[PDB]
Amino acid sequence: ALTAEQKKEILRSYGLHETDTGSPEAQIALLTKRIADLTEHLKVHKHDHHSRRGLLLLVGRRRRLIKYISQIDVERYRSLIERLGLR
Amino acid sequence: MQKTIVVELEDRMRHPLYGKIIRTTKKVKAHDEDSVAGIGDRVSLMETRPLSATKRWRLVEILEKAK
RNA sequence: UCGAAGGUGGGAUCGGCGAUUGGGACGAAGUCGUAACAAGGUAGCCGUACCGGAAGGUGCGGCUGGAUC
RNA sequence: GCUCGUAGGUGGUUUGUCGCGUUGUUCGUGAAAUCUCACGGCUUAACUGUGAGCGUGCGGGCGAUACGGGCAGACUAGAGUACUGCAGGGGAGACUGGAAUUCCUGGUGUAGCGGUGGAAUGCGCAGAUAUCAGGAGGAACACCGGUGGCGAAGGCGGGUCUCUGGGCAGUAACUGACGCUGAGGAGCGAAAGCGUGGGGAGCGAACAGGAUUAGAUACCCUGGUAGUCCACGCCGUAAACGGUGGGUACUAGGUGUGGGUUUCCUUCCUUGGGAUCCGUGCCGUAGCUAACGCAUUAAGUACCCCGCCUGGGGAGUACGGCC
């Protein structure tokens, strides 16, 4: 899902400067929202393997991004972990 | 480890036959009379007499302490 | 106190033999069929299952490394 | 079989610094003998002595910074995000439609039907087949339909609704190398098969009868159980095939077809031509190949990572272990 305005609340809350859409924080927030929503989808429809694969790809992408932000600035990494969740 | 620090050393050396440069890591154990050193913390060491069964290094100085 | 050798015990592990039994290979000019190679006389192979003296047969799905106008 | 991903390996353009890699030089060491080159001595030679090499290396000092690497930055070309469009049998769930087969009930109706190369077994005369009306139930979805589309692969087509994944193009708005591959590992994975429960029209392993035959544990015929279907788990194999691992760049063309964008010819209404991006086919040059063939969708030219091979059998088998 994630209609335009639905992405807008997330981008306003997690982006950097009023037009930020590609920063690691914004991307991680959007990926987390998509992952959550697809998880409630997959709690019903246990046999939608073709969508569970999309979930797996999103998880992998988010893991790369989290690794990158940790490498580049540990303070930003820690703040983002506390703002969203880990483990 | 109570006044002991464990430091990982990496070195690269040409392969004897194939000629590629292989990277390998070691793990030496060093001495801290005043134990102040945390994880990360690139450090400098100097090898010394057998201060213990396995310790042969002494911490010199903690340069560019961990982030 | 430590202590070799010795004794007791339960295991581990590496080999040998073993009535009987499973397959394998090689043997002559033995017996039974004819499965494959040609459309090999029911196209053949692959996975699986059941069946049958034996090569094998049949079902389901697959492939052309088969045909057809 | 396919994918995701851990360690690892490898890494776009650009500035400064370090001098680990790399490279220059010098000092120490690399015993002697043996080895090589030149002499010297045994009558020659083997043998022996001397001198120089060699000793690929390692350690110390002093130089260099092109490339690799580290450290500190920068950039947008790779990668990702955003917006706007676009095509699709991609997936899951729920409800629902009609054709046809089978059976049941009733009407008409009378002696055959069925089946084969030819027959028989079989069904029927207690009313079959045929024909008409009504009903039950399961499974598969004619035409569209293709060489065509989507999916990582296996695979996916009656319709509607709900939920959901990916792709392409355009813009250039954003981040600023965040990339590639990936040992082990995890997930998915036709059919057959297994467990528990339900369902069962048609088909149909096993099984039975008939026929053929020397025989016929078959092919052909008449029946027929599991199974095929559904729910939830397991199994994890296929000629799982393009018999061709993934990523990237480059190297004549011609001609089909699917999805975009786009000027100009903008009507030449033509939805034709050209250009560009992403697919999917055929044919062909260079090149490659043992040949067959491949040939911008490479089996060509190169670079990065992974898997695998080492004569045929025994054998993908035994033993051990894991599931």
Added chain:
RNA sequence: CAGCUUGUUGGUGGGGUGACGGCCUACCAAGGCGACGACGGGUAGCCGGCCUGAGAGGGUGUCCGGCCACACUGGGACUGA
């Protein structure tokens, strides 16, 4: 051969030694090694060298020379530089 380790890993005070040291002891902490193969099994003295090879490699360690280990099998100390 996938889990090995409890003086084991580290510290403090003592002891011991020619000498540092869990070398030993009391106490304290809970570490240490491992897919770059720990732990286990098989085999083996190591090298200058020797044989082969265009070389890189492969095989080998006999004469000679250097180092190590042992002296019927196992353990122990004494004397002494």
Added chain:
RNA sequence: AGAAGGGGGACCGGAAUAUCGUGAACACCCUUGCGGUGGGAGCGGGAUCCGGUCGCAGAAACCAGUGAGGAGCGACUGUU
């Protein structure tokens, strides 16, 4: 599976005066109660380490599983 197979066990003293663990008197606040906090007395409990003592023997008398292996039948507890 209590598989099997082994080791310790008595008394006295010391550690030990809060050694440790139970309950918590005298005395310490207060929304004054049948209240709270500290406090640690006296009374009981258990284990260890070290040293010593005695006997043939320290589970002390009474009390209190024998164990292992291979077959047949029936799965098992039960019932006759």
Added chain:
RNA sequence: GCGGAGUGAUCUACCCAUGGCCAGGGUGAAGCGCGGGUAAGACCGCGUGGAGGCCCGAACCCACUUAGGUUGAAGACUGAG
């Protein structure tokens, strides 16, 4: 032994209502917490908990073996298991 009519469940068999009883030890199920593990999970390690026609063993209920009894203490018992 056969028939008719009656008597018996105060013994024993089963059932029904209503009460009572089962010393002491051991083991450690589900569930629930905590930590680990992951994207989330499965799963793993600890605690807590106290299940079971569970284990050892008195009362209680039985009756497997043996010895005694066998004109018995007793027309079915005693002792030791």
